[PDB]
A paper describes a structure:
Active transport of proteins from the cytoplasm to the nucleus is mediated by a family of nuclear transport receptors known as importins (or karyopherins), together with a number of ancillary proteins including nucleoporins and Ran1–3. Importin α is constructed from an N-terminal importin β-binding (IBB) domain and a C-terminal NLS binding domain featuring ten armadillo (ARM)-repeat motifs. The W proteins of henipaviruses share a common N-terminal domain with P and V proteins, but have a unique NLS bearing C-terminal domain that is recognised preferentially by importins α3 and α4 (KPNA4 and KPNA3), rather than the better characterised importin α1 ([name]). In this study, we present high-resolution structures of importin α isoform adaptors bound to the NLS regions of HeV W and NiV W, providing insights into the molecular basis of importin α isoform specificity.
To test whether the same binding patterns were present in the NiV W protein, we examined the binding determinants of importin α:NiV W complexes using the same approach. We observed binding patterns that were very similar to those seen with HeV W for both importin α1 and α3. Crystals of the importin α1:NiV W complex (that had P212121 symmetry and diffracted to 2.1 Å resolution) bound residues 436–443 of the NiV W C-terminal domain. The binding interface was also similar to HeV W, with the importin α1:NiV W complex mediated by 15 hydrogen bonds, one salt bridge interaction, and a buried surface area of 688.7 Å2. Notably, despite binding the same region of HeV W and NiV W, importin α3 exhibited a 2.4-fold more extensive interaction buried surface area than importin α1, with 16 additional hydrogen bonds, and six additional salt bridge interactions, consistent with its > 50-fold higher affinity. Both W proteins interacted with the major binding site of importin α1 and α3, involving residues PPTKARV of W and ARM repeats 2–4 of importin in both structures. The importin α3:NiV W interface was mediated through 31 hydrogen bonds, seven salt bridge interactions, and buried 1591.8 Å2 of surface area. These results indicate that the interaction of the henipavirus W proteins with importins is highly conserved. From enzyme-linked immunosorbent assay (ELISA) measurements, we found that importin α3 bound with high affinity to the W protein from both HeV and NiV (19.9 nM and 14.4 nM, respectively), whereas importin α1 and α7 bound with much lower affinity (1.4 µM and 1.5 µM, respectively, to HeV W; and 1.5 µM and 1.1 µM, respectively, to NiV W). We found comparable binding using microscale thermophoresis (MST) assays, with importin α3 binding NiV W protein with high affinity (4.4 nM), whereas importin α1 and α7 displayed a much lower affinity (681 and 696 nM, respectively).
Author numbering:
A (entry chain C): 436 to 443
B (entry chain E): 72 to 497
């Protein structure tokens, strides 16, 4: 899983 | 119209003395930052807006601006370590923790997400989020009779942020934090949503990636049978972390390994060792190599489950990394096994692929194979059959490889190979 993620 | 604002207009609106103009400009910022193409994170930071956004997090009488600024700050914190640090430096951690208690679920969820990004930067920010007191309120959001009453996306974000609080080493998370989180994690590991299951498994894999005391904390909560069930899942995003966790656990004591065996894990390895995904095959073979480094009864259970032919198969044909792990499994098997177990190994066809792998450009695998060959020859000695084995090795062409190894660079290599020649082929 990604360490971070943006909300789009 | 909060679409395609200039940064200068956003600054103008946020510097107004009007909470609704500030709300409009913050929404415009959010929309800039939530586009896929090169969101202007650094321009927003340079405009000096983070402190304003953080202050907006506390505006309880204007929940829209709480939500808009939470989203903007989430996306800034999703960037590089410098950008995440910019968010932390503005005081965002305590403000987001305070928003965890919002009566508005989309706002609490956005605070969960932001804290996940901050903690996901690394060990220091993870531990700083913990020190500011995030765990209690996070877990409170999950303290319901049935997780199914929560919205799917909300539950997924909570699980993911929790997994980031379990992630990373040097140092690993604080022991008390792990103990506080584990019961909720175990409850999430039994939930029916594939993404929640996957991220719960990842968290468990992080927590078992360490010394035997961490492994034991996890194993004591009783998760091994559920991990074995998930090891059998059809979704690969679940199998992968479940297998990672099982492999970690079998790096531990012989008793923790035995808990893995008793839960039925070995029955899954016929498929894992033939899985079309290379990384699954490789991690399954690594796990096997740690199981064959165990006790003679554990080797025997590897035998009873029919797994030696699957190791012969991986040695015969697989990704080279997988083949190297298989060679390790064989050396461990022969180092710990009884004479009968090693004989069985030979009867399954190990010799020819083991020999064929000696033409590898990797020195480590050559050392490992030569050690395995020596151990097998020792068992043959104990039976008085060394000539049979020597003939086998010669017939498939391995003796030529061993002789070629006499002129090898590495010291241990030619030491080993000429020992073999002088001891069994003279």
């Amino acid at each position: 899983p990604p360490t971070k993620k943006a909300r789009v | 119209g909060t679409v395609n604002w200039s940064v200068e207009d956003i600054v103008k609106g946020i510097n107004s003395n009007n909470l609704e103009s500030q709300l409009q400009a913050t929404q415009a910022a959010r929309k800039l930052l939530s586009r896929e193409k090169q969101p202007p994170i650094d321009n927003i930071i340079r405009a000096g807006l983070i402190p304003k956004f953080v202050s907006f997090l506390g505006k309880t009488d204007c929940s829209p601006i709480q939500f808009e600024s939470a989203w903007a700050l989430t996306n800034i914190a999703s960037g590089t370590s410098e950008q995440t640090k910019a968010v932390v430096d503005g005081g965002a951690i305590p403000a987001f923790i305070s928003l965890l208690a919002s009566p508005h679920a989309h706002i609490s969820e956005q605070a969960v997400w932001a804290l996940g990004n901050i903690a996901g930067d690394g060990s220091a920010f993870r531990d700083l989020v913990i020190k500011h007191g995030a765990i209690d309120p996070l877990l409170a959001l999950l303290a319901v009779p049935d997780l199914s009453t929560l919205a799917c996306g909300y539950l997924r974000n909570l699980t993911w942020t929790l997994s980031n609080l379990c992630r990373n080493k040097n140092p690993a998370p604080p022991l008390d934090a792990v103990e506080q989180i584990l019961p909720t994690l175990v409850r999430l590991l039994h939930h029916n949503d594939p993404e929640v299951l996957a991220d719960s498994c990842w968290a468990i894999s992080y927590l078992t990636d360490g010394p035997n005391e961490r492994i034991e904390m996890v194993v004591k909560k009783g998760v091994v049978p559920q991990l074995v069930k998930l090891l059998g899942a059809t979704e690969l995003p679940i199998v992968t972390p479940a297998l990672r966790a099982i492999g970690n656990i079998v790096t531990g004591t012989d008793e923790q390994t035995q808990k893995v065996i008793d839960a039925g894990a070995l029955a899954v390895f016929p498929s894992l060792l033939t899985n079309p995904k290379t990384n699954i095959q490789k991690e399954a073979t690594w796990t096997m190599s740690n199981i064959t480094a165990g006790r003679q009864d554990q080797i025997q259970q590897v035998v009873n489950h029919g797994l030696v032919p699957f190791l012969v198969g991986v040695l015969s044909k697989a990704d080279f990394k997988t083949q190297k792990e298989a060679a390790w499994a064989i050396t461990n098997y022969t180092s710990g096994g009884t004479v009968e177990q090693i004989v069985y190994l030979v009867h399954c066809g190990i010799i020819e692929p083991l020999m064929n792998l000696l033409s590898a450009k990797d020195t480590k695998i050559i050392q490992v194979i030569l050690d395995a060959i020596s151990n097998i020859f020792q068992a043959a000695e104990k039976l008085g059959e060394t000539e049979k084995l020597s003939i086998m090795i010669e017939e498939c062409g391995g003796l030529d490889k061993i002789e070629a190894l006499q002129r090898h660079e590495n010291e241990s290599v030619y030491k080993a190979s000429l020992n073999l020649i002088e001891k069994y082929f003279s």
